[PDB]
Scaffold this active site. Structure first.
Site, PDB file in Angstrom:
ATOM      1  N   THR A 189       0.879  -1.189   0.000  1.00 19.90           N
ATOM      2  CA  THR A 189       0.000   0.000   0.000  1.00 19.90           C
ATOM      3  C   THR A 189       0.898   1.214   0.000  1.00 19.90           C
ATOM      4  O   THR A 189       1.870   1.250   0.716  1.00 19.90           O
ATOM      5  CB  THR A 189      -0.915  -0.136   1.223  1.00 19.90           C
ATOM      6  N   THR A 190       0.517   2.187  -0.773  1.00 22.29           N
ATOM      7  CA  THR A 190       1.100   3.492  -0.699  1.00 22.29           C
ATOM      8  C   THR A 190      -0.047   4.488  -0.678  1.00 22.29           C
ATOM      9  O   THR A 190      -0.893   4.461  -1.541  1.00 22.29           O
ATOM     10  CB  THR A 190       2.022   3.649  -1.916  1.00 22.29           C
ATOM     11  N   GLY A 204       4.647   1.344   1.318  1.00 21.05           N
ATOM     12  CA  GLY A 204       5.334   2.070   0.262  1.00 21.05           C
ATOM     13  C   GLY A 204       5.811   3.431   0.730  1.00 21.05           C
ATOM     14  O   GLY A 204       6.612   4.075   0.098  1.00 21.05           O
ATOM     15  N   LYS A 212      -8.559   2.826  -2.057  1.00 18.91           N
ATOM     16  CA  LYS A 212      -8.136   3.035  -0.701  1.00 18.91           C
ATOM     17  C   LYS A 212      -8.420   4.458  -0.317  1.00 18.91           C
ATOM     18  O   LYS A 212      -8.215   4.780   0.811  1.00 18.91           O
ATOM     19  CB  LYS A 212      -6.657   2.713  -0.583  1.00 18.91           C
ATOM     20  N   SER A 257       4.517  -4.597  -2.329  1.00 22.08           N
ATOM     21  CA  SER A 257       3.181  -4.639  -1.778  1.00 22.08           C
ATOM     22  C   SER A 257       2.296  -3.519  -2.293  1.00 22.08           C
ATOM     23  O   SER A 257       1.192  -3.372  -1.789  1.00 22.08           O
ATOM     24  CB  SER A 257       3.255  -4.554  -0.285  1.00 22.08           C
TER      25      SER A 257
END
Lengths: 226, 228
Positions: B1-2, B131, B33, B169
């Protein structure tokens, strides 16, 4: 009793068992070699005892690495022992040092190994001179390690029974100018002149080179150039 | 995830990649997200999808109730405060990095980071996700504040792309939304028009020279590409 073991000096600081092994090399078939600017050529007269050998039998010229080879002169089995040790050194150089073994290094290693067997009562000296032909990063190189382990670089070199004559013929060549192509011709020609016919009736001449044309790989030369 | 958010004069951008991973497999390659809390207040979620979806739904609910009750807009501070409360009450049982960002007329655009421990910190920009560790230097080096809306959108897209080019990821799309006095503009850059990736950076086109051919020299040439 001065001459039974290589662990012993004579009163004149000679080591006879080494001189004696030396004689094994001198009573052997002749080899010559020439180190040009484009590569090394080594040739050697194989003397058969039988008319019924396969062509290829008792090769005296062995590759030791991609870029290096050893032509043995003298007792072939003893030489295959050296060839095995040279190969282990070459492998070591590639495995540990990630570089092809330089030729001066290879010949030194070969010499050290041969010399070791002139120091200890339990082993005898090797009955063979190795000619080492390399063309690694140190350039074209031709060394000879004799049974004493003494190592020397040469432009051209002759060993075995016709060595004294073959050297006279090798002196006529111009090493500064000579190329691997010409040398295969000359060196082979030389071994035909100095071969004695009424003694050693069966013989081929094995030739090998490592040069710019062979992509600096050490190889028998194709049997068209001979 | 970023996930990240950045302030510009009069609003905020939120951005995120789209990947949800169960370790090393991607279960969702198009997750969203950026989750709406009110009209002009969003969160970006990182950590446990379950946890963050449950909190966002809860906070969005509370905030809608609250807006109907006071008959007026909600402040971003209120949204952040609630989020912080809930994140802190459940800090032991959830994995949840939040950013709450949005626009309200009293305070303009705001950004709050609410990381795992349930701190709530008001910032100019915020990063979150696995991230994010890749973007700190990117911001330190390349982010100047005072950017226009459009500059800020492009910069956040770049920033996400940089992050997800290195974080295994994170990945997929880049979703953004801007939030200011005007209507929210969501955007979605698909991966194949990402403004950065390693697979198209010219400085990663030459292959590392690992598979050298067997040679008589130490001079390094290239990889052995063919048997011949």
């Amino acid at each position: 009793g001065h001459d039974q073991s290589t662990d012993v000096f004579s009163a004149e600081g000679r080591v006879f068992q080494v001189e004696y092994a030396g004689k094994a090399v001198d009573n052997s078939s002749t080899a010559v070699a020439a180190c040009c600017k484009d590569g090394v050529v080594v040739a050697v007269e194989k003397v058969h005892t039988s008319r019924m050998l396969e062509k290829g039998s008792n090769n005296r010229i062995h590759a030791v690495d991609r870029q290096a080879g050893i032509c043995i002169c003298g007792l072939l089995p003893d030489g295959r022992a050296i060839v095995s040790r040279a190969r282990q050194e070459a492998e070591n150089s590639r495995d540990i040092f990630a570089t092809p073994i330089r030729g001066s290094v290879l010949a030194n290693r070969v010499g050290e190994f041969m010399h070791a067997y002139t120091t200890h009562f339990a082993y005898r000296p090797f009955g063979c001179s190795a000619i080492i032909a390399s063309y690694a990063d140190d350039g074209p190189q031709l060394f000879v390690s004799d049974p004493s382990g003494t190592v020397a670089g040469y432009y051209g070199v002759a060993l075995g029974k016709a060595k004294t004559v073959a050297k006279s013929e090798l002196e006529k060549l111009d090493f500064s100018s000579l190329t691997c192509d010409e040398a295969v011709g000359k060196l082979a020609s030389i071994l035909h002149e100095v071969h004695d016919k009424q003694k050693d009736k069966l013989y081929e001449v094995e030739v090998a080179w490592v040069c710019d044309k062979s992509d600096r790989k050490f190889v028998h030369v194709p049997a068209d150039m001979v | 995830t970023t996930i990240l958010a950045v302030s510009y004069n009069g609003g905020v951008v939120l951005a995120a990649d789209s990947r949800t991973s169960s370790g090393t497999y991607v279960v969702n390659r198009a997750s969203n997200k950026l989750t709406k809390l009110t009209k002009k207040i969003y969160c970006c979620r990182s950590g446990s999808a379950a946890d963050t979806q449950a909190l966002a739904e809860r906070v969005s609910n509370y905030l809608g109730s609250y807006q109907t009750d006071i008959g007026a807009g909600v402040n971003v501070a209120t949204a952040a405060n609630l989020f912080q409360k809930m994140c802190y009450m459940n800090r032991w049982n959830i994995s949840a990095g939040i950013i709450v960002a949005g626009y309200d007329p009293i305070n303009g655009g705001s950004v709050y980071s609410i990381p795992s421990g349930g701190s709530c910190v008001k910032l100019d920009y915020a990063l979150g996700g696995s991230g994010s560790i890749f973007l700190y230097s990117f911001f330190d080096a390349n982010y100047k504040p005072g950017m226009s809306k459009s500059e800020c959108v492009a910069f956040c897209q770049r920033a996400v792309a940089h992050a997800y080019s290195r974080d295994g990821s994170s990945g997929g799309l880049i979703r953004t939304i801007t939030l200011d006095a005007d209507e929210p503009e969501d955007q979605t850059i698909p991966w194949n028009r990402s403004p950065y990736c390693m697979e198209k950076d010219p400085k990663y086109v030459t292959q590392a020279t690992q598979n050298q051919p067997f040679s008589s020299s130490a001079k390094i040439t290239g990889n052995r590409m063919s048997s011949t």
